[PDB]
Structure formats: C-alpha cells, structure tokens
Design a protein around this ligand. Sequence first.
Ligand SMILES: O=C(O)C(=O)NNc1ccc(Cl)cc1Cl
Ligand SMILES: [Mg+2]
Ligand SMILES: [Mg+2]
Length: 714
Amino acid sequence: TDRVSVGNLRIARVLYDFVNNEALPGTDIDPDSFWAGVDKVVADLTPQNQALLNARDELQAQIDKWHRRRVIEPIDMDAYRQFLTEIGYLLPEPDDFTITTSGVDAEITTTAGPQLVVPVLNARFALNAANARWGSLYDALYGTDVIPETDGAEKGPTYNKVRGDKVIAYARKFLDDSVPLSSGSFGDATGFTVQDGQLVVALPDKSTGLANPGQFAGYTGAAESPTSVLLINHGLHIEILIDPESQVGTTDRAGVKDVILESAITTIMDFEDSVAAVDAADKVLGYRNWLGLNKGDLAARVLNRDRNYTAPGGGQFTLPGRSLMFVRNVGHLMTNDAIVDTDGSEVFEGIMDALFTGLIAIHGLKASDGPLINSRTGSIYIVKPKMHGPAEVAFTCELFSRVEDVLGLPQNTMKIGIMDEERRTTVNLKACIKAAADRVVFINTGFLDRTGDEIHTSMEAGPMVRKGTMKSQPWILAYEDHNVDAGLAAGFSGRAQVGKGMWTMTELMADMVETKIAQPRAGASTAWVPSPTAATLHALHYHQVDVAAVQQGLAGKRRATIEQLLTIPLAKELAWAPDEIREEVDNNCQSILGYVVRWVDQGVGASKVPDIHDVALMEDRATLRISSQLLANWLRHGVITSADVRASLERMAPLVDRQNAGDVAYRPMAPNFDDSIAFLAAQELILSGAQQPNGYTEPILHRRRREFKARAAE
Ligand SMILES: O=C(O)C(=O)NNc1ccc(Cl)cc1Cl
Ligand SMILES: [Mg+2]
Ligand SMILES: [Mg+2]
C-alpha cells in the first residue's frame, strides 16, 4: 500500500504530500498537530454524521408508507401536516431572533450584485471568475444576443460598426437611467472634465453636472482631460473609459471607448455539483487550484491586481480588482477513498473538505506574492450544500468549530452559506438559520436540487408534473418567497446575503436581461450567473432595482404558508397525450445522457450542454437529480414502461453523439450501448432512481466514473 498511517486513518500519499509540501507551509500550523487533529475530528464526528444520514432514511420510509396506506387523493393537508409533526420532520418554529455573524466583508453584508459559481477543478475558468469583478459592458453587449442580430447588425469575422453603434446607444441609455444628468442625456455628451471636485459633462449647447453629484466617485488621468470617469450607483461602480484613439472611441461623440461595470462581486469556487472528483487525485487537483487562488499565484493567465483611482477632490484610493471568494464544500452524504480507515472504509468527504479547504483558506487571509487576496475582515466563507433540517446545520457548525481548533483559528472564523435546497430545510428554515446564527453569511434557494428533493420525497404520492412545469408550481413560488421572508426576519438586511438561483441558458442573454430582473425585485441581494459575461449583464439589474429599498418594504411580511410549501406537485388526472409523454421522456433521457457522458468519460461536471432543442444549458449535477427522479416517478406510477425508457435512451444516444462533434476526446455511445459505461450509468440512474437516498446521483456516478477510470488504465 502507498497510504500514510496517522492513527486510525490511512491517507492517500498524493494527498499527504500535497498538504505537507503545499498547503501547510506558511500557515504556522504544526504538521504533526494538524494530522492528529484530522484523525481526532474524523473519529469524533463520524458517528453523528452517520446517525444524521440514517435519520433521513427513517423519515423517508415513514413518508413512503404514509402515501401507500392512503387511497384518497383529495389529500388532507391537516392530516399530512399533523403526520409530519409527529414523526419530527416538521419541527416547532422558534421565537424571532437576529443573527449575530461578525467579521464579514462589505461585499457580503452590504453590496447587492451578481454571484458567479465555477468549477474549482478548471483552473482557467476559476481564474476568469476571480477576475470577473470588473467586466466590459461593450464586450458583453456586442458579443451576445442582447443586441439582436437583425439585418445589418450581425456579428461577423470583424467589427460591424452598425452593431457597435447599437452597443453604444444601449450603454448611453443605461447611463441616463443609472446616473442621470441634471439636464440632457449622456447620448449627447461631448466631453468629461473634473472641476472643483465636480464632474462636468459637456453638451452641444451647454454643460451640466450629475443630478446627484454624490454618484461621482473618481477618475483617472488629468482632471482637465481624464482617461476615465468612475461613478457609483446602488453601491456598484461604473467606469467610463475615454480614448478617441481607439476603434470605438474614434467614432464616439465623446471619445468613449467602453463602459466597465463592477460585476461579479463574489464568486463561489465549487468542489460540489459542478465538478467530477471521485478519488484522491481529483480532490488534490481541486485543492491545489483553491490553494493557488488563495495564495494569489494560480497561473493557467494570472490574477488581477487592485485598481487605482483619483478621488473627486484629488486624493488617491484603490478598489478591489478581484471577486471575493467562497468555497462550496460537498455535503454530508458521500465518502471518498482519499482517506480510509484500517478496515478499508472510506472517510466522509464533507469532513475532509472542511479540514482541507479551511486549511488552504488561511493563505487568503495573508499577504500574497502584494496585499492579501481574499478576506480583509478575517473570515473564511464556506457554502454548505444539501443539508436536511436544523440538526444537520448544527452538525455543520460543530464540524467548523472543531476545524477552527485544529487550525488554531478563532471560533466563528469559518462562515456558512446555507443552501436552502432540500424540503426539510425549507419547512424548518428559521430553525436552520438559528442553528447557524453566529456563522451564517447567506441563504440561497438552490432550486434545482430542491426540485429533485421535492420529487423524491413524494415519490409514492403519484405521478409528478413535467420538468419544465416545475419552475411555476405553487410549492416552488412559495419556497422562493418563504426563503426571502425568513432571511429578512432574521435581520439579513445589512448583515448577510439573501440569494437566488442560476440562469442556465448561457446563450440566451436577451432573455436573461428581460427576466432575471425578477430576482432583485423579489428582494434577493444576490443571484447566480454562469459566466463573467452573464455577471456583467446581470449587474444591470442591480442598477435598475434598489434591493436595499425592496428589502425594507418586505419587512415583516409573511407571503408563504406552510400549506403552500407543502403542496406536492402531483399531475392532474389525464394530464398528457401520448405524444406529449414521449416528448417529456425524450427530453429527460437526452438531458441525462448529455450530462452523464461528459461526467463519466471525461470527468467534466459542468459545461455548455445542448438540450433536446439545441438550446445551450450550463447546469450542475442537480439537473440530473431532477431528470432521473422524474423518470423514476413516471415509471413508478405507470405513466411509462421500461421499454419506453430503453427506446428513448436508444433514440437520444446518437443525437448526443452528434451534439458532441465538439471534438477529440469523445467516444460515441451508439451503437454499442452495453459497452459504454456512460450509457449504462444513465440507465442505472433511471432504473435505480427510486432507491437512491433522497434521489442523490453521486453514489452511482462516482462508481461509474471510477469504473471508467480503472478501465482506461488497463
Ligand atoms: O440549483 C441547485 O441545486 C444548485 O445548487 N446550483 N445550480 C448550479 C450551480 C452551478 C452551475 Cl455552473 C450551474 C447551476 Cl444550474
Ligand atoms: Mg444544489
Ligand atoms: Mg436608485
């Protein structure tokens, strides 16, 4: 064996060496003490971790039985709610309280804006996300369908001036809307100067200042001929770049070259659903990128420095050039063979992530190679996914407390971003926030996982509505409102983020700009975006909507009831025709196959995957949880047959093969289906779906990826 013995633990050498040689030096933590800490923490907390997982199983069994002994279906909410209380699923709600989390950075407590999520295993994307704090509005407008590609305004091999003019006009309107002039429009501006600390905008017939001069934050270059002008609106910066000697500046009435927006204020570096990591080698690749990010020296090419400005009165200041980083650890379920015990049993991966990502995060609290890169207030920001109820939140907090001791960190250094993405957390949300009242820095509606959990929890109740129908069901609308209500009641305004979910259609940016505005209008101080380009565009929404004002107006409102949260998305009688059934089956089988083939064969856990209609979607593993559970549910209830499923997987497999003329590493699934580990994975996810704990896909996916890896070696 190649493993290292530390107490009852047998640690993969690749991980032992990474930690000793790369993660530990510079933290002043004694290596022998760290490893003894790992052994003791794993030993002490493993049984409670296991008890919590068994408790999930016991509750689900009781709910399964409840539905199976019933035959009514007008569905008595009073009985159901009573039952959930008796069995300890629905817990009493505690008295009102206010969170006490402290030492949190301004980006989280105060600033409303986009939050970018990226797979930590991809160094290039991680670097780009960290750098996405600032982004070009002209690039985002020109490069996407926000400016329609109508006749004459199409993207070509080279710069189309007509399209560029539309870009310019769009951005001028944004300026008028966000940082209005006392009179006239930015559209007619002819120059910018700074006089007596005041911004002066030259118009054809006169000059003018800002309607609100306080929105003038600074500038670069000579006041009398500035190279840029910095503005602020709703706590977010906007920079007008001035350069008549540029290809766009040359044609512009004021010589404006670009408008840069502060965009991805924060970024979540993901170890969970957007990555595929099934062994020590995979975890180390992730840990090493997270290490490079925190040390400031990740190069795939490099991290940006801070931005220098001149203040209005003429003094100097700087603004952060980087997105403030969270890390999303995995949740309570999975083990990983990066460490096993003397019996060969794998160690819980969530416990390992807290220890290792926490250790590594110490570097981001110290000086780089310049200033320290991450939290100036001294916090480590960890997103904890897939928790079920307040005992699991408490357990996470206790894990973090124990890790802080191993690491020599002050108590409550390790903050928690709570995913509200499981039903038992949803209906006990206030108690969940309370369990973490001194650690919580966000709540976020992870709606894809939540949908997966909704289907599995009520699997035995009856057939569910179609996948596309789910986003508009009463349960989910109530879930979204309830989340906001609970956060604001716990005093999140000015203290912690209230967050909403991901826009998955990466190429549909016009649609994004039209519709995602709903989230800040609902009082969310942040929401997830798939890319730096999407961060720049979503930033527009925060300039249009005053989230702080919206949150204050929502104060003390209760807009969702428990009954509404508990409304199971059962399909009504005779809901669909035979063609519509096949359309839905095909939809889900294509979604599963498209995602699974990249996961199992190439270890990619997130990417732009074309759907059955060739719309490009970037989703994490939770989309697979939904599709596999929905098909399992339809099979469970006789909506479809096992031949229907087989036929659909067969029909969709070559279409996915074709869609993956994307290139070099792709192996087709058809026609040798039973020779494709990825094809068999997809089939197994559906046919064993009903029996997976809470519908989780990881046990099957991890097994199949490891199988693939093992074959690729021999
Ligand atoms: O909705 C959920 O369960 C969730 O946690 N995340 N969604 C998500 C995360 C990362 C990427 Cl790259 C894309 C998506 Cl849709
Ligand atoms: Mg999730
Ligand atoms: Mg305003």
